[PDB]
Structures are given as structure tokens and as C-alpha cells.
């Protein structure tokens, strides 16, 4: 049902479904996988973690597998949203193309 | 000076620099390409084309490099845009980040 793009900075993981793009930032995400596992309230957000990791492609496959599979894939538990999304007719548009 | 992200939708490749991503439609790169090789006023717009190409990453690093080094990277001989450019600072900003 989506499609990895692939990594952004050390910092983002590009993935889209039929609909939007998506831009999942990879340490509001561990976070939350970690939370879901884990469900401690008094964590620091990780929305103050600056340097990048590259991550392996197996590896993003697994952090993306279990962010659609999630309860809660939208926001950490502080409520910091895990991605930003783009409607793909947003894009195509920009060029002239009809989505 | 860039990154070349990878391709979307076998319609769009996806490349960065410190600034911006950009959404570089194959179509009107490859358009504006051949028009720079052959400066043909009749031919007809590749706004058209529908129908994707999956593309090699080595076919892929070659429009790319061709593009940047372009005297006329912005727009096809018709006037549609290669690409829409999104600033990366927006995309930080929706997770809660400074860019
Ligand atoms: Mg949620
Ligand atoms: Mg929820
Ligand atoms: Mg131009
Ligand atoms: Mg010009
Ligand atoms: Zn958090
Ligand atoms: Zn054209």
C-alpha cells in the first residue's frame, strides 16, 4: 500500500501511498516504535536529537513496516507530529500535470 | 552541490541541495535536453506524456548531472517548469525542527 523513496539528511525517510507523500523523521519514529514497546512516560522527546544516522535499506524497511503498522503512527507521545505529508496532486500540479 | 534522491512514480526524480527538494519531471528534462542538442521549435510538448519509465540510477545520475550543468534548467521550451522546489526549512518546520 506505500512505496519507500529512501532517506533525507541522516534525518527524514521519504515514503508514499497512493495519495500523499510522506516525510517521516526517523527519530520521532524510534521514539514512538520505543514507546509502543515500552510505554514510558517520562522519556525525553527525541524532536531535540540534531545529528543524522544513515540507516541500511533493510533497516528502513523495518522502521517503515512497523510505522504503518502502528496504533499510533502520527505523533510521538508529545505530540510532535511524526511526519509531514504532501498531496502527490500538489506536485504534479506545480509541473501541469492532472493527478 | 546536490543529492540525488531517487525516482518517483517512474515520472519524477527526486533531488536536493542545501536549500530545496526538487520534483524534476523526467519528461520536460529530457524535453528541454534533446532541445538544447536540437533546437527544434515544433516539437510537440512532453506535457503529454503519460505513461512512466522506470530509469537506471546511472540514466538517472546522467540527466541529473546534464540538468544542473543546463543553460535553461527551469523550464521546457513551452514554458512548463522541470520541476517544483519545496523548501527543505518548510519540511523541518512541520515536524517541529529549525532548518
Ligand atoms: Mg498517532
Ligand atoms: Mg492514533
Ligand atoms: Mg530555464
Ligand atoms: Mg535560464
Ligand atoms: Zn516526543
Ligand atoms: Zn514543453
Known amino acids: 500500500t506505500y512505496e519507500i523513496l529512501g532517506q533525507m539528511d541522516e534525518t527524514f525517510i521519504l515514503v508514499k501511498d497512493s495519495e500523499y507523500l510522506y516525510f517521516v523523521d526517523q527519530h520521532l519514529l524510534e ?39 502502528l496504533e499510533n503512527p502520527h505523533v510521538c507521545p508529545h505530540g510532535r507530529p511524526i511526519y509531514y505529508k504532501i498531496p502527490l496532486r500538489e506536485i504534479y500540479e506545480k509541473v501541469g500535470r492532472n493527478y
Chains 1, 2 share one sequence.
Open 31 to 69: 521514539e514512538r516504535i520505543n514507546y509502543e514497546k515500552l510505554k514510558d512516560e517520562n522519556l525525553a522527546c527525541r524532536i531535540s536529537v540534531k545529528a543524522g544516522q544513515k540507516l541500511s535499506e533493510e533497516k528502513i524497511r523495518e522502521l517503515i513496516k512497523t510505522w504503518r503498522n
